[PDB]
Amino acid sequence: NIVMTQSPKSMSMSVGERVTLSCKASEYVGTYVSWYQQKPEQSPKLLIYGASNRYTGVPDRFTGSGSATDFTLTIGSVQAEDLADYHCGQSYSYPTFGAGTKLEL
Template sequence: MVSLRYLLSVFYLFVQASHGEIVMTQTPGYISVSPGETATISCTASEDIGNALDWYKQKPGERPQLLIYGATKRYTGVPDRITGSGYGSSFKLTIREVSEDDAANYHCIQRKKFPLTQCFRVIQKPSSVLRN
């Protein structure tokens, strides 16, 4: 038999999560850059999250790939042309010398508190690159 104490704990956690959620925003939904240019993606949190922000790259049908953790630290193997900056509630991911391989969804995910929340932006290939 499940105790009332356990049920109350679960309910409390649910209420806390649903009312204390950090909202992450990025605008606009996508950017289009040409090869060799610099792309900057911004991410804003609804409250101060310190440096508890990670950036992921995800191509369609593939698993997300960690690029930046702790807002500014580059993950192993990530080229130095990709940098993260920011603290508090305002963050940026900068990709210099963009190549076709950079066309993907980029997710910023806060990990300050549960539930973890995210948003993403698409870097799109220019139409001239898409044509065969």
């Protein structure tokens, strides 16, 4: 079991600034951590597969930064609809997801 500490647990940012989320694994997960966006009453939608690779239909403001253990997800100039839960999950082993970060305004 590879545990993923996703930070911060809850953060609020206004509209129009670059926001950075972090997800640090325990063991090695080499560019195999995906980022999902779970809006309320909705199923998660894949945003960043691999380590930094936008899924077909993802805006150009979501972009990832990969490594062996620590990964980041940057949303430059968030809109009003970017408010959801953001879950990182590795797949180098059996998939284990992070606690998620609540995005508020």
